[PDB]
Amino acid sequence: KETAAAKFERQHMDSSTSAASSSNYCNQMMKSRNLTKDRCKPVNTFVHESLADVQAVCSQKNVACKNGQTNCYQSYSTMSITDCRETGSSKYPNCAYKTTQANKHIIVACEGNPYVPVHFDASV
Ligand SMILES: Cc1cn([C@H]2C[C@H](OP(=O)([O-])OP(=O)([O-])OC[C@H]3O[C@@H](n4cnc5c(N)ncnc54)[C@H](O)[C@@H]3OP(=O)(O)O)[C@@H](COP(=O)(O)O)O2)c(=O)[nH]c1=O
């Protein structure tokens, strides 16, 4: 089984590297984290920070979520992340991704008790 917090960890956390490794990073990560089983997720972001630093975001700047809900929080500092975005020729089952490294503020939705991240909303 997988709790909501565990799913966020599997889908968005990669503390191992301080930044995306090779240009093949996304293709490999989207595959190993089971993010292309039923379809190709159009976009997925991986965070290269410790879990504690990401969990701490739930006690930072409260802001509105893209879906209108208000349980989203923006990080005060910028974090190291990798955006994985499909290429123009990507088509299930052969999902392919462009790897883009970046340093930006992250916005996640938190829920639960403990109040932890369960959804990655955006980067700014
Ligand atoms: C834009 C963008 C998107 N993504 C990623 C983020 C999403 O994956 P994701 O895996 O992070 O999305 P999810 O909806 O599956 O979130 C996992 C669970 O979180 C719950 N939840 C709780 N609070 C909220 C709020 N406030 N908004 C949205 N969702 C919320 C939700 O109901 C789910 O419950 P279950 O499905 O029952 O497990 C995906 C879609 O892009 P969308 O444009 O629709 O947001 O792309 C990313 O990784 N990076 C990006 O830059």
* Domains in the chain: boundaries: 1-124
DSSP string, 39-94: S--SEEEEE-S-HHHHHGGGGSEEE--TTS-S-EEE-SS-EEEEEEEE-TT-BTTB
Distance 18 CA to ligand 1 centre (A): 24
Distance of alpha carbon 94 from alpha carbon 100, whole angstroms:
19
Which residues, 6 or more positions from 26, have their beta carbon under 8 angstroms from its beta carbon? 20, 82, 84, 97, 98, 99
Q: Which helix (H) or strand (E) holds 12?
A: helix 4-12
33 marked as part of a ligand binding site:
no
Specify the resolution in Å. Answer: 2.0
Structural tokens at position 76: 């005060």
Solved how? X-ray
What SS3 class is residue 24? coil
Instruction: Report the candidate in 124, 114, 111 with the shortest Cα–Cα distance to residue 72.
Output: 111
How many angstroms separate the most distant Cα atoms in the chain?
42
Residue nearest to ligand 1 atom 30, measured at CA: 119
What SS3 class is residue 10? helix
Residue from 36, 83, 121, 124 whose mutation best tests the ligand 1 pocket (most atoms within 8 A of CB): 121
- Class of domain 1-124 (CATH, top level): alpha beta
For 44, counting Cβ atoms within 10 Å of its Cβ (0-12 exposed, 13-18 middle, 19+ buried), the class is: buried
